[PDB]
Design a protein around this ligand. Sequence first.
Ligand SMILES: [Zn+2]
Lengths: 90, 31, 141, 51, 1111, 148, 50
Amino acid sequence: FIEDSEAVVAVDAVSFTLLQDQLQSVLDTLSEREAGVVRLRFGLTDGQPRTLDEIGQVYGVTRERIRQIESKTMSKLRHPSRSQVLRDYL
Amino acid sequence: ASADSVRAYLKQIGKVALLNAEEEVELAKRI
Amino acid sequence: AMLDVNFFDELRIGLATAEDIRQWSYGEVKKPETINYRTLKPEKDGLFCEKIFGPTRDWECYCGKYKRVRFKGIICERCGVEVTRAKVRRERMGHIELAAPVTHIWYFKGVPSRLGYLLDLAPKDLEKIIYFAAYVITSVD
Amino acid sequence: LRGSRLGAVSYETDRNHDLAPRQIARYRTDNGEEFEVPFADDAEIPGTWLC
Amino acid sequence: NSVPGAPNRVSFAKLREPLEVPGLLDVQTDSFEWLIGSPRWRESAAERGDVNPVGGLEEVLYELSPIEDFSGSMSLSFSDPRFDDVKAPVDECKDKDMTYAAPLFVTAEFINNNTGEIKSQTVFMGDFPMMTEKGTFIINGTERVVVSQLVRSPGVYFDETIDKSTDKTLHSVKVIPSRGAWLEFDVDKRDTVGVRIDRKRRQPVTVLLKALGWTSEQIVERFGFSEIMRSTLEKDNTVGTDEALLDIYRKLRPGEPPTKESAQTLLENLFFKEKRYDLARVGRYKVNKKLGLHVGEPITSSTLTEEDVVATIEYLVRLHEGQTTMTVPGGVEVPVETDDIDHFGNRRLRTVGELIQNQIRVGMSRMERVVRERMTTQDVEAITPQTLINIRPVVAAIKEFFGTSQLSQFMDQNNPLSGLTHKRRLSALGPGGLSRERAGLEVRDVHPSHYGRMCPIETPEGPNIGLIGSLSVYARVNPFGFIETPYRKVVDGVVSDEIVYLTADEEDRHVVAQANSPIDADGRFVEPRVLVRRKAGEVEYVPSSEVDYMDVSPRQMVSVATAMIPFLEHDDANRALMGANMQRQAVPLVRSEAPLVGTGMELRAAIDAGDVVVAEESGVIEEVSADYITVMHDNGTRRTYRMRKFARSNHGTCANQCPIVDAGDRVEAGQVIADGPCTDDGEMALGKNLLVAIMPWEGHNYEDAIILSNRLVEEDVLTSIHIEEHEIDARDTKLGAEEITRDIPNISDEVLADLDERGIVRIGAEVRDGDILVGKVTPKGETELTPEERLLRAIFGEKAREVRDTSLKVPHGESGKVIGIRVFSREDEDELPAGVNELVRVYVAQKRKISDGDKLAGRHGNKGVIGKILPVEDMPFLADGTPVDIILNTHGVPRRMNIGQILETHLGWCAHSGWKVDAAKGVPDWAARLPDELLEAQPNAIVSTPVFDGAQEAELQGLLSCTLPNRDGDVLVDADGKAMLFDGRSGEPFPYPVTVGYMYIMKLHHLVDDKIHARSTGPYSMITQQPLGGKAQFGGQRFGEMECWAMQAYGAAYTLQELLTIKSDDTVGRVKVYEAIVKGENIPEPGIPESFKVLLKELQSLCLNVEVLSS
Amino acid sequence: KLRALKRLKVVAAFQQSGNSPMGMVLDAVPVIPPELRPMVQLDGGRFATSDLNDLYRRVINRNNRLKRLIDLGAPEIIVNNEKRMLQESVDALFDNGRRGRPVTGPGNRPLKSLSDLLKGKQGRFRQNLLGKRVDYSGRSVIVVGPQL
Amino acid sequence: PGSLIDRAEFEAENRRVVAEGGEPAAGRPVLMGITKASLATDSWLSAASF
Ligand SMILES: [Zn+2]
């Protein structure tokens, strides 16, 4: 009679898969620089979260430029067009 | 049965005779 | 087996030798410790040791160096826990290297005494030999 | 009642391709049996080990 | 009758019952106050049994008194039990979850022998729980009732068997006492007499007889006529008291040195030194009566007397001799028989008093052990009973009894009757009795001694039939614990009014007549040939001179709940049993209409069930309000009775109490002053009087199904309020403290709207499955966030607030309003269990209406679910346009042998329309024996038929043919009892007249909303990975072994593989199945379950190499 | 002849299996995976053992103490007693209630050896391997429909 | 002797052993109750599940 409060919720796992897919599509709407900065900044490609200096190094620019592209991209995604699609997962 | 290992042990340890300070001194010196 | 299918076509029982046992085990428990009293994490070389029996957390070793999938199949060189999925603890076994031999209770006491026939001794007689209450001569010239 | 073994669960695809390359190290026991211990590449391999 | 504000309910009783119904809760209250020693029981003993007081507790203290050390230098005698006042009133204890108790004070006394002192104190013994006024213990805050148990009485059981190898009668005796030992005197296959003493390898008599001080010469002296004993004397094979007792010690104590003094002392120790042997008061009286040793001698000396041993042997050998009676020197002779283990002369009632006494003894003995051990260790001239007595054992024993026991059950209170019937319950399946597996099938049959001592009808119909019953109406429990029964003493063919109570033994001795006999208004019988009962249950026509006892009234054999069934004598015992077991399952409706047709037991079952406020002493009401009645007791004083409006019962039902008096009415003592849940003017009313027709209509009332008008739903005729309780505790945790606060991590302000500020809902918010009744947030600490989740959290600007949400949410399908919220907190000093800083209980409640699948039943066992609630226009209506309200089926009536419902139907109509006996030409013979003021009746006039002296069928025929028309000139129901119904749906009249009437039907507590259940994916068990079980969780339905056989028989292999792999256990397969369903793909191929891998690792753990090799 | 028959049975059984009865003398003893003997923590801190934890702990304690005594070189009395206790506890773990009174614990409840998980009516071999709770399921009370 | 064996195995064994020197094993039909019939199932798995 002991519910294991750690089991796979079934709907949670499939929901996470759907979130992965939808987020991937939305990020693919971003420009190449934008998609790259987002994926690296939030570790969507290897699970390692790269920080601003690493991202500026692998793109060969200054970290201030990386942060500006970051802010611009975030604001673009906050736009309801590509936002309301992902609201429900949260 | 005699399954009680408590008994199987107590009846075993009741064998060797009990000693005294005299024999204790002798034993300790020997040891 | 470790990896299973639905092609199972023969379930074959049979007594297991200790040689088969220390090749099953993925480690050896030696300390009668269940879980630390204060931090509530398994002990090393205990009855729940993650090194012996696999991680309690999905793709995380004990000391927390490797904590993601990209590190899988590897063993962290300091806490020794192999980073993998956390259901191996359902399947990895241990063993205990005894200091002296010991006998079963199923093939001896269960009527009829299979050992009792085997070595040609009555059950009650053997219940005095394998509980340390009678000597035995093994050979003579 | 509701209880759970103190622990955690992850929901991520078990990608079998893009991982961190390993490096199997041999560790001879006193009796001489060999027990493979996979280690990562950039990883200081210890001289001794509990097999 | 005899109750001031009695509903004027005209009875059909042809007879006249002399004795009133007793104090229906005396079996509980008198037993408990016997335990205490209340002045009430003191005066009761002064009346009957004034020989001496036995205050329960007192007896325990006296028997224990004193605790003497082995050295015999120090003695302790706790004595004079005393009770303080209850620490808190009832309602406060029930609200604050306190156990309603009162302290025990006892004068302990310690005495040193050598120097000489007494050390007297007043030691606090413990907080002892107390019976309420309603015969219940409020233990732990609930309402628990201790059910009386039936157990074999200590005594001598002479019984015999036959031997098919020899064909000889083999008699035997057992004397199983309390706290003693077993002894057997048997007569074996040969003509010898085994005397097996304490379970080990028999004995010849002579060993004991000499050891008992009886020489072979003395053996002949008393047993000369006993040719069997004389033959055994020849067979003695041993002589001499010393040698015999020496061989006793050598055998009974195997291998123990048979020294004379140890053996001599052992004889006493086992049988006469009363510290290891005590057949109690009950057994002593039993054996005294059996052997007739003593009559006026007070019941004392609760230990064996060797005088009785030799009498036992003599009685046994004369029983084998085939004697009729036996005279023992020093006592009046007794007759010679055997004994049965059912006859209520051998099964006694260990009432609540005796059970609590036994548990207190189990406590006191432990206390005594500890006391004496410490006394020995303690130094002398320094100690006192305060330093000796440990009161932990007594408290522990009483707690483990009231809580955590089989014989202390939650009072099932769905309706008041279920309360009064969970009391008065006899249960044979208790500790010290028999389990439902060791239950001899001879213990469940109604031995003919049950007549007037235990109802043969009412028993649970589950796997408990006969193990649980209920006391009769007039039964009364003897001090010793034997179920007495009142009878009328008939002398010189003259029936008197001097009620005399008799146990089962004197029921066997004497001869018993019937109450429905022609008494000729003088005590005189009329016909000489009279129905009567003999000893062995035989029924015989005795001449009317040898009758010495007559029954007090009919309906004496029957319980309380079954006596409320009208026309019971027409119903079969199966369906009457069902009717009695479902008359305790009705729910309290919002209107509570009294039954139009009933027995005399609707008023006496409410004024004594405790769920009706009673005017204690006469007065005039001043302020009648929905909460409080103020009565002005004549002599100055005033008293405010307080109601319990909308109080949750122990099964979720309402417990309202509304007054029935006005501000100027005068009340008398013992009057009903306020109805309870199921009551109307003081008469037990569990259901409504619904119009019923008995046609089979369109297959909706097919096979016990019942259809209803929509009038029942609309006008709120059948509607039960259910108050459910939810509870969340703010327990401490290692990571931090769980805070009941409004804010919750992801919970938006939309759902949060209900929560006020503390976290609790506001009284009145209509909660629905999923609402946040109490908002509690639990610390979680820092845990890794998946890259994807981190991205979303940042993009949408939502942070973590690691503290996790575990708020209480209303269970699935438990909507309704929030009647009240009760908050217990540690800051308020509320004594919550350790670790709980706050425990809040929310009482949600819903007004459930009748619904398809709800179970309705009459009073006759005619249960049935509601197949369909039809609209009001497609319902067969009369010629007047009045639609019928339910439509039962016909095919269920004749094959179930319960035509009671039909008679109840016809009489019901008669009682509604009102009759007028056409006595213009004199009272017709049809009513020649009918009482006065039944020659005419008014519409909706209440009537009653007692159970076994009810309405003779002829009376019903004539009444049915003598009803007055409704409003026009229209006799709707003709003499046959049927009426011409018009089909409401089609329109054409039905071609044949149909039975209509008013039947009283109830709403059972098997509602659909408590039963419907569904699961797609929910919680999972822990060790094995199957779905969980029960409606409290989600769980699934056990696809058991027999269903596996069923689908093997069809050949459905793929479905079996499904239901046993990827719906229950295939751990990695379930999530893949769900993902494939959502993505719209073929359901994946199932895998090995998780019950063929735990097995594999167990077999590789018991060292059995179980392996799978395809080849 | 008959006594030979019954003996003849088991001896040829070992001969034909070619299994070399050594399996009766149990050297290194295998330990069942942790999850099959869960230490669930019921909310409130109350831990829940599985009673196979306790038996395994007993065997391990006695083995450790035996190793210690062997190193010290205790007199034959103590070493033989401790070997006896090892044997007793291994026997208890593989079956509790056989070869003597049951090894009990709190409330004098007998423990649950591996055998009591694979025997009688509560073993896997007479239980959940008969019936299984299933998802995608429900129940309800039934009524008659003379329209379907 | 006294052991109970399936008929098909019995006849197949006799067919095998008439060659390599001929000797018949003498068999007699037996009637056993359903319980005993189940007890002689070959599969240890079902046998234990019983
Ligand atoms: Zn590590």
